[PDB]
Design an enzyme around this catalytic site. Structure first.
Site, PDB file in Angstrom:
ATOM      1  N   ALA A 131      69.119  95.416 -30.372  1.00 25.92           N
ATOM      2  CA  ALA A 131      68.129  94.732 -29.284  1.00 25.92           C
ATOM      3  C   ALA A 131      66.933  95.302 -29.366  1.00 25.92           C
ATOM      4  CB  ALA A 131      69.017  94.972 -28.067  1.00 25.92           C
ATOM      5  N   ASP A 132      65.861  94.420 -29.514  1.00 26.56           N
ATOM      6  CA  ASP A 132      64.521  94.719 -29.328  1.00 26.56           C
ATOM      7  C   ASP A 132      63.869  94.506 -27.927  1.00 26.56           C
ATOM      8  OD1 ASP A 132      64.531  95.701 -32.028  1.00 26.56           O
ATOM      9  OD2 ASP A 132      63.647  93.941 -32.890  1.00 26.56           O
ATOM     10  N   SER A 133      62.671  94.849 -27.976  1.00 28.91           N
ATOM     11  CA  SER A 133      61.768  94.321 -26.799  1.00 28.91           C
ATOM     12  C   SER A 133      62.112  92.852 -26.121  1.00 28.91           C
ATOM     13  CB  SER A 133      60.385  94.649 -26.757  1.00 28.91           C
ATOM     14  N   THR A 192      66.000  92.559 -25.894  1.00 22.79           N
ATOM     15  CA  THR A 192      66.340  93.104 -24.687  1.00 22.79           C
ATOM     16  C   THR A 192      65.996  92.582 -23.441  1.00 22.79           C
ATOM     17  OG1 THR A 192      66.194  95.360 -25.679  1.00 22.79           O
ATOM     18  CG2 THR A 192      66.211  95.461 -23.510  1.00 22.79           C
TER      19      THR A 192
END
Ligand SMILES: *OP(=O)(O)OCC(C)(C)[C@@H](O)C(=O)NCCC(=O)NCCSC(=O)CCCCCCCCC
Length: 82
Positions: free
Chosen positions: A36-38, A41
């Site tokens: 989960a990246d920015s 997320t």
């Protein structure tokens, strides 16, 4: 949070970060570990807010480390309303 609530969040997350078929999610699995990246997320909370019909800031969701961690926080919001 109960196992049911966790399943809902895990179901949405695993799907958001992938198909959920080749990805294993657990209450002990960290969001960062899932990838989960920015950009992702933010999408996770966005979907949950819409699915759970709530609103939470990213700053507050800082104490979140695992799937259930978010689950417990969300359950709290539901209890707050109605
Ligand atoms: O978006 P990306 O391309 O990954 O950018 C990363 C960035 C370059 C902005 C990096 O500098 C960064 O991450 N900055 C912000 C500080 C940071 O590292 N944040 C990590 C975010 S991880 C997180 O919040 C884990 C829990 C997520 C919970 C989501 C669901 C919560 C529901 C209530």
């Amino acid at each position: 949070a109960k196992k049911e609530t966790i399943d809902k969040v895990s179901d949405i997350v695993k799907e958001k970060l992938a198909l959920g078929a080749d990805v294993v999610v657990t209450a002990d699995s960290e969001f960062s570990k899932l990838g989960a990246d920015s950009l992702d997320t933010v999408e996770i909370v966005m979907n949950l807010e819409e699915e759970f019909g709530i609103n939470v800031d990213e700053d507050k969701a800082q104490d979140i480390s695992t799937i259930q961690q978010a689950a417990d926080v969300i359950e709290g919001l539901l209890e707050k309303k109605a």
